Design a protein around this ligand. Sequence first.
Ligand SMILES: Nc1ncnc2c1ncn2[C@@H]1O[C@H](COP(=O)(O)OP(=O)(O)NP(=O)(O)O)[C@@H](O)[C@H]1O
Ligand SMILES: Nc1ncnc2c1ncn2[C@@H]1O[C@H](COP(=O)(O)OP(=O)(O)NP(=O)(O)O)[C@@H](O)[C@H]1O
Ligand SMILES: [Mg+2]
Ligand SMILES: [Mg+2]
Lengths: 248, 273
Amino acid sequence: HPVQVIAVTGGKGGVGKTNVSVNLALALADLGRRVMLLDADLGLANVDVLLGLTPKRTLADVIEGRCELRDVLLLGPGGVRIVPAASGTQSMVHLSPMQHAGLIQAFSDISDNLDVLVVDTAAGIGDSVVSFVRAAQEVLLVVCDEPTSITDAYALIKLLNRDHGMTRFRVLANMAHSPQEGRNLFAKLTKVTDRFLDVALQYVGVIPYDESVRKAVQKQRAVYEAFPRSKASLAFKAVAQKVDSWPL
Amino acid sequence: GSMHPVQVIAVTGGKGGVGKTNVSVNLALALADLGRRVMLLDADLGLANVDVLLGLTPKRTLADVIEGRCELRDVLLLGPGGVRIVPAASGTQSMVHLSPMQHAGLIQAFSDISDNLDVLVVDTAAGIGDSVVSFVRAAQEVLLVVCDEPTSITDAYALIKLLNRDHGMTRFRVLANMAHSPQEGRNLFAKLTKVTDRFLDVALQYVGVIPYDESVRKAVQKQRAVYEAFPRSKASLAFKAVAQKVDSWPLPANPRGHLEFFVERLVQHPATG
Ligand SMILES: Nc1ncnc2c1ncn2[C@@H]1O[C@H](COP(=O)(O)OP(=O)(O)NP(=O)(O)O)[C@@H](O)[C@H]1O
Ligand SMILES: Nc1ncnc2c1ncn2[C@@H]1O[C@H](COP(=O)(O)OP(=O)(O)NP(=O)(O)O)[C@@H](O)[C@H]1O
Ligand SMILES: [Mg+2]
Ligand SMILES: [Mg+2]
């Protein structure tokens, strides 16, 4: 039983990486999978904030040697297991390759009875982002239809490909006003990556712009839980069906 | 007389997508519209967006400067309103882990292009990484852009806490963005003040609020600044009001430097000449 590992990323700030990570995790749990969600925004933790959780200890405690990784695990909704990050601990955003590797390696000790790990990455193209993305089997790029997000997503793809040997990427359009808007967005990325790179982009669909997501964030409850019948939640179910179909 | 003070503002906020770059671009344009000589630095070093919001196509960037291929003056672009822009790179990693020395070298380089300058606006990256903290500490005024969601409040607080705890920074300016009601900006400021009052020793200063405006969405699509493309929009009028406030912050006349106890080197306000 190999664990499916999905890194949710995108370069651009605020495109919905954390919302997608949280609600994809919940949707996969709804399909019957045993799911873990790692907050890899190591110094600006938001997974706990979106879920209204107040972690006593975090990955900060782990790295500083005050506790073991198993000791910081939190229970989220639907049985999802959460690994919480720190908020405001600067050292956590520039960890050595050794510390990053050590952390990733340490997950093998809490891998029991697990089907899927979802990893929520920070904004940007920094070492923490690249380290976690490189360590995943599937790279889910969250993109929205604005020139800055398209530009940032392309930059991250180019970087991961040219410096880190990554050659396959999943693309999810978030805050789309229509499914066709997402397809057109994917078409844009396909043309520029076709022209300059040798990579395989695979489209996963859209999460629509949905006021229910804004309401869910205010409530600090996952939209998938708080508004299970909303268009966004139904779209997360669809993405989960696709993810679950991917070869391990 | 014989030292002209320069205002230096770092626009930051921790949270991704809160409007740091939109605020940087449109504050710069609004200040230029008031008659100030403005420079705008894209300090999102590895994911440049200032050029993207303005529809500029740089041939050289900060990466070329830092890596010793050209000088800072060579990469300056003339933007709307006469704002001079220093463009960043897009997808060059060797930029989101510069050494403290390399950051220092970049900051030092601005002294060569300071003539005829009133204000430098610095657009920082998301997060609390070394690049962000270095550029924030290199400025005189730190402008946190915050919106009324728990994640923005939490991230803004985290940045304030780190700067206060680790670097002794005490005073911060706060600008609310994407507000949907007239009192939302002040209410948001109060939320942040509540948390910082309880746990920190800081002095927050409320600057104002930019409303959520569909005109910003349209401007970003057109790759034109909302201040230029929709000058009568609610967002653009708010940027005008905010620039008038920013412009009123007093600068020392003829800043000639002073000594401080247990500080070896003269301490001097940013200035030119
Ligand atoms: N499908 C959606 N519909 C409506 N609003 C959305 C949607 N997805 C995201 N949002 C909004 O976008 C905000 C940012 O989402 P978030 O998941 O925090 O993005 P992020 O990419 O993780 N941000 P960051 O980690 O700081 O770079 C949310 O708080 C909502 O306001
Ligand atoms: N006042 C506003 N009204 C409406 N939309 C806005 C407003 N300000 C920002 N936006 C939207 O928010 C998006 C993000 O703005 P942007 O200025 O790129 O934020 P940022 O903090 O610089 N992101 P990043 O650098 O990637 O962390 C914009 O592209 C617009 O969609
Ligand atoms: Mg996030
Ligand atoms: Mg930006």
